[PDB]
């Protein structure tokens, strides 16, 4: 929800009317925003709009907020607000909604135009647990629309080296993304032929059928080395 002066904010809690504060006339705030929104953002226009809103709602007209107008000084708005039984400058004594006690700081309250932005949280919430994967590399797909997985990116990797968590970094980049196993000849470090049904393992080339190493390795790195061997570069996976 955004005011008309660049005061962004998501809704954090929803309290009922018995939990809202209230004036001496039973006015509860529809929206409560922190004072910390406006000591560093200079949006005094928010306060002046709120003051003119109180004056306009009490008087019975739509107030004027034309830029560069010299008849709408804040002292004039304050003097008009004084005529309707309220404080000179905005404030009004609120009572605590829970304990019923007076608040010993007079809260600045009044009407202010708010806008609901397109960004609702039900359109952004997203989660995955071993969903669909891509064709090219067997990594999780991209984006909420496809039940896809978040990128654990290059900077995430780097801060995980900074922490020193080797196993967590491996679990994010091996176990939870694309686990895979390959069979590699021991003499030449080249991906061999494996027959998981008949258990007949052979390195075409060397005519080796005796020793073959199993390697746990990501599918993306397998595709990397297969594209290297497509371009006549041989990454030899020598495990000795």
């Amino acid at each position: 929800f955004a005011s008309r002066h660049g005061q962004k904010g998501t809704c954090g809690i929803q309290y009922r009317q018995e939990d809202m504060p209230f004036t001496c006339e039973g006015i509860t705030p529809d929206i409560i925003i922190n004072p910390h929104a406006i000591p560093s953002r200079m949006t005094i226009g928010h306060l002046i709009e709120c003051l003119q809103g109180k004056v306009s709602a009490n008087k019975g007209e739509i107030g004027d907020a034309t830029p560069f107008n010299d008849a709408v000084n804040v002292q004039k708005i304050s003097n008009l607000l004084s005529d309707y039984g309220y404080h000179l400058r905005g404030n009004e004594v609120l009572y605590n909604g829970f304990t019923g006690r007076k608040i010993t700081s007079q809260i600045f309250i009044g009407p202010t135009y708010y806008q609901r932005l397109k960004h609702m949280v039900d359109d952004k919430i997203h989660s995955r647990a071993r969903g669909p994967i891509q064709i090219l590399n067997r990594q999780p797909m991209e984006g909420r629309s496809r039940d896809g997985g978040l990128r654990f990116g290059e900077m995430e990797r780097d801060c995980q080296i900074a922490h020193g968590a080797a196993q967590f970094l491996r679990e994010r980049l091996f176990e939870a993304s694309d686990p895979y196993q390959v069979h590699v000849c021991n003499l030449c470090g080249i991906m061999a032929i494996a027959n998981t049904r008949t258990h007949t393992y052979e390195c075409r080339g060397c005519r080796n059928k005796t020793q073959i190493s199993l390697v746990r390795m990501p599918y993306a790195c397998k595709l990397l080395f297969q594209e290297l061997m497509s371009m006549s570069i041989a990454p030899r996976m020598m495990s000795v």
Partner: protein
Amino acid sequence: VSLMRVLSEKDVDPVRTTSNDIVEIFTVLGIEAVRKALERELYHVISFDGSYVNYRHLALLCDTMTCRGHLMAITRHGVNRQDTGPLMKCSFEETVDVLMEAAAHGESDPMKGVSENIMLGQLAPAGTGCFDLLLDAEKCKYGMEIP
């Protein structure tokens, strides 16, 4: 900057005339001197915001740029030129060119860094990965055997 001729001039202090040009400090005053100058310039650049960065990260950065005698740029032309290993140097930038160089010269990557072990999915030699956990049987025979 004409630092050496300025130092040679009469009636200027020859022990404290320091400039902010890194390469002239290197060519005139040495490698430890340019390490100290690079320290002082990197500390001077973090001064106007008032934020203090600890003197064990500036020193490490300066020792990495002044380790190999020649002053080391933090670009491909200085990080890919030191003889670390092809798989980190292709993970930084200029990927296919470093792989061609390694293929053509027959480079043998010893897998001793963290980035190589990351990209092949095995346990990286990180903070908790520089270990070797072993099981002892002398201590294991003790205790209560509930399950």
